[PDB]
Amino acid sequence: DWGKRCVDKFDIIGIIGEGTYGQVYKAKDKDTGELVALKKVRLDNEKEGFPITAIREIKILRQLIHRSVVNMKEIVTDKQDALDFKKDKGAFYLVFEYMDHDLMGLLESGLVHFSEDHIKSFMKQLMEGLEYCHKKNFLHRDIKCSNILLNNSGQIKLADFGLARLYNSEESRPYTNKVITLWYRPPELLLGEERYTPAIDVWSCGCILGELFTKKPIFQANLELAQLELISRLCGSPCPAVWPDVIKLPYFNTMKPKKQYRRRLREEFSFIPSAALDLLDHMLTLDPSKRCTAEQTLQSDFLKDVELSKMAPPDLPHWQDCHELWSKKRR
Amino acid sequence: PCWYWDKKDLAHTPSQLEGLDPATEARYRREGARFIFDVGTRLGLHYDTLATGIIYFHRFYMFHSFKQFPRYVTGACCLFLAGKVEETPKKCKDIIKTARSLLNDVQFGQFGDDPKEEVMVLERILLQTIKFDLQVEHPYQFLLKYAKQLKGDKNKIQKLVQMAWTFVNDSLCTTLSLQWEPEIIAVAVMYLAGRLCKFEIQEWTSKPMYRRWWEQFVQDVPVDVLEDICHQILDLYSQGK
Numbered sequence: 001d002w003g004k005r006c007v008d009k010f011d012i013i014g015i016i017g018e019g020t021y022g023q024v025y026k027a028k029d030k031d032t033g034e035l036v037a038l039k040k041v042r043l044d045n046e047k048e049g050f051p052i053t054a055i056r057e058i059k060i061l062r063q064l065i066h067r068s069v070v071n072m073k074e075i076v077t078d079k080q081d082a083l084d085f086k087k088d089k090g091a092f093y094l095v096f097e098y099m100d101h102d103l104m105g106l107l108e109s110g111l112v113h114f115s116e117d118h119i120k121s122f123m124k125q126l127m128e129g130l131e132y133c134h135k136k137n138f139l140h141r142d143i144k145c146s147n148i149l150l151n152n153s154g155q156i157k158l159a160d161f162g163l164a165r166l167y168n169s170e171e172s173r174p175y176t177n178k179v180i181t182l183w184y185r186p187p188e189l190l191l192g193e194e195r196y197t198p199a200i201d202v203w204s205c206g207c208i209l210g211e212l213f214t215k216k217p218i219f220q221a222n223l224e225l226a227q228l229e230l231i232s233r234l235c236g237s238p239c240p241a242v243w244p245d246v247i248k249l250p251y252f253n254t255m256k257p258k259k260q261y262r263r264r265l266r267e268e269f270s271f272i273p274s275a276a277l278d279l280l281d282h283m284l285t286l287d288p289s290k291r292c293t294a295e296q297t298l299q300s301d302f303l304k305d306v307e308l309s310k311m312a313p314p315d316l317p318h319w320q321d322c323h324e325l326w327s328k329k330r331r
Numbered sequence: 332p333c334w335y336w337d338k339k340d341l342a343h344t345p346s347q348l349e350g351l352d353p354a355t356e357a358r359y360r361r362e363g364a365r366f367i368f369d370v371g372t373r374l375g376l377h378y379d380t381l382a383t384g385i386i387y388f389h390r391f392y393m394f395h396s397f398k399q400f401p402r403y404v405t406g407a408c409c410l411f412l413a414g415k416v417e418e419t420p421k422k423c424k425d426i427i428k429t430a431r432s433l434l435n436d437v438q439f440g441q442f443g444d445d446p447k448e449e450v451m452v453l454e455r456i457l458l459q460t461i462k463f464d465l466q467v468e469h470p471y472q473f474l475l476k477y478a479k480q481l482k483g484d485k486n487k488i489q490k491l492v493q494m495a496w497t498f499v500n501d502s503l504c505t506t507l508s509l510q511w512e513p514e515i516i517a518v519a520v521m522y523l524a525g526r527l528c529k530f531e532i533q534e535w536t537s538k539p540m541y542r543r544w545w546e547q548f549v550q551d552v553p554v555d556v557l558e559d560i561c562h563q564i565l566d567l568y569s570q571g572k
Contacts, residue, residue, distance in 0.1 A: 001462050002462060003458065003459040003463055043455060045451040046448075048422060048423065049411070049423070049454050050415070050455075050458065055416055055465060058463060058465055059465045059466050062464070062465075063466065075463055085452075085455075088452045092455075092458075166418075
């Protein structure tokens with residue numbers, strides 16, 4: 001019975017930013033004391049009202065309770081016009097777990113350099129959350145560095161499920177296609193694929209895996225065509241040899257790179273650890289069918305034995321568990 | 332949260348307890364439900380989008396009276412949310428264009444001065460009323476998944492689910508969505524479509540001698556309960572198709 005509780009339950013600390021729907025605030029709860037993120041859903045009438053972005057998020061997060069995902073704790077509302085109603089204008093507040101930093105903010109400093117053991121730890125967590133989403137048939141469709149949050153305890157959580165939609169393999173209907181930020185957008189979406197696979201998120205995580213080593217985004221264009229060449233300049237050009245079913249893609253024969261590049265990936269990322277390069281090579285395959293799945297990423301030599309298990313030292317107290325919610329997720 | 336009542340408890344809605352003729356609630360419900368079904372298909376919306384809006388509607392009036400909330404405006408609001416939920420959203424402008432259009436001019440009077448506001452502002456309490464439980468499943472999904480696991484002649488199946496499907500469309504005007512899980516309703520319409528067509532359904536399953544074929548999809552569901560769902564639907568053809 002969400003939306004009944006009061007915001008007076010929460011002591012607001014500060015404004016984190018303007019979000020995809022209204023604004024995002026940091027706040028603590030006067031009852032427990034644990035800190036919380038609040039997404040303000042200001043309801044605008046004479047427009048379209050309750051945003052789908054807030055709806056996609058709610059619908060999915062109430063089915064996703066996992067360690068590597070910022071979980072939605074509850075929903076709370078403003079005041080209570082016990083008279084009239086119809087006067088409205090009150091907002092709804094989405095209550096999430098709180099993370100201090102995002103990977104984009106940290107990497108922007110040029111101060112933080114993650115050791116291989118950390119990247120091994122970060123990816124293992126990330127690919128475990130995405131594997132969970134895909135196991136429950138949800139596409140994130142908006143995976144970027146600014147959407148990958150990180151607290152001081154080392155814990156990674158995937159955020160912003162405002163573009164996330166349910167997926168079935170029976171190819172039910174065309175999707176939006178113009179999804180994901182241009183820099184983290186896979187080749188098939190650039191060529192105009194409408195009915196896409198979960199392997200689009202795996203591409204984005206791969207582009208982030210390369211960014212953790214190079215300390216800079218590996219694909220950085222401004223227009224869609226120029227982005228394809230940058231990919232071709234590294235992963236090789238999309239063509240029937242490397243990729244059987246590109247011919248069935250709409251903008252292929254029209255949107256071509258300058259030459260038929262030979263794949264130069266292992267050459268430009270040669271400084272990267274061997275097993276890490278093996279994973280990056282796989283996560284950044286042109287043909288989505290030959291691309292790596294999230295389930296498979298955790299079976300790579302680079303992630304397979306990365307022990308995130310909380311029995312080995314050290315004991316981190318500030319780690320946000322989810323077995324409270326998951327247990328409570330019986331009701 | 333739970334969204335399923337037993338038959339003994341549905342005679343205790345806030346509407347009726349406030350002194351309402353049960354026969355008129357069924358009217359208001361069958362009317363309101365059918366209203367959504369028509370407004371949706373005219374806007375050209377998916378069938379699951381139609382059903383979620385209807386199930387929202389049925390659920391809403393289990394916590395509110397038809398007196399305090401005009402039957403026809405709520406249904407419009409339910410469809411508005413449902414469009415956004417099932418990722419087939421229409422602007423509220425386009426639905427109000429259907430609100431005046433397919434409807435009695437005094438039935439349109441329910442929306443008051445500004446249908447937009449009356450629909451848009453209502454959304455706030457609708458979301459709160461359904462306890463922010465936005466994902467809803469339907470007998471449609473299970474009907475197909477069960478018929479795909481049936482091993483016999485296709486053109487018998489093709490006609491089997493052809494009439495079982497329509498039955499789900501029929502049932503939406505009633506509180507079956509408020510009575511049984513969508514899987515069990517899906518089993519029931521397979522049971523019914525199999526009887527009136529004289530198709531014996533077991534003979535297409537792994538065990539052709541267990542008469543109660545359905546337990547291969549569900550668990551321990553009695554033939555009694557299944558016949559209850561069937562009867563409630565038979566009354567629909569008896570009066571309003």
